[PDB]
Design an enzyme around this catalytic site. Sequence first.
Site, PDB file in Angstrom:
ATOM      1  N   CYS A  28       0.913  -1.290  -0.077  1.00 41.57           N
ATOM      2  CA  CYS A  28      -0.124  -0.010  -0.125  1.00 41.57           C
ATOM      3  C   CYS A  28       0.979   1.318  -0.025  1.00 41.57           C
ATOM      4  CB  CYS A  28      -0.930  -0.012   1.021  1.00 41.57           C
ATOM      5  SG  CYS A  28      -0.292   0.448   2.864  1.00 41.57           S
ATOM      6  N   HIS A  89      -2.458   1.671   6.991  1.00 34.89           N
ATOM      7  CA  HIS A  89      -2.945   1.731   5.597  1.00 34.89           C
ATOM      8  C   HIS A  89      -3.217   2.913   4.909  1.00 34.89           C
ATOM      9  CE1 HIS A  89      -4.072  -0.830   2.203  1.00 34.89           C
ATOM     10  NE2 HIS A  89      -5.274  -0.188   1.982  1.00 34.89           N
TER      11      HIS A  89
END
Length: 148
Positions: A28, A89
Amino acid sequence: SLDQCIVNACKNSWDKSYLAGTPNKDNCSGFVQSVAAELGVPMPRGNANAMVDGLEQSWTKLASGAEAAQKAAQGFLVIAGLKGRTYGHVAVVISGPLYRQKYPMCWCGSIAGAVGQSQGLKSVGQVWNRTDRDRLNYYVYSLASCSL
């Protein structure tokens, strides 16, 4: 909407490897780095947690998920980020209708496999789970990347 250039950066980034021998779809943080680099946007570096620490310091925060999609529709790079106690994230918010009238569309890579990954048809509300999705921070870059 003006986000086509941001969407193109996402498509090109998907198969790049910011980190050696690590495809951006499995990372990510790396994915957002490649998206930023194509758009010419200086991006805080490091892992997701480190990236969020930087965005908190130097980028404007948006009020809601609804607002994030508007700013994306106006051609701004918008990062969705949330710190974890182990791992955070990050995702790129794109324009389009809001899932459950709240959660914007996004692109993101993940070590978690397909469950964590989005290519623009999963919202942030389908990447982060039901408790994390209402805790999200949306950060916007000072200058719009796409034009006319």
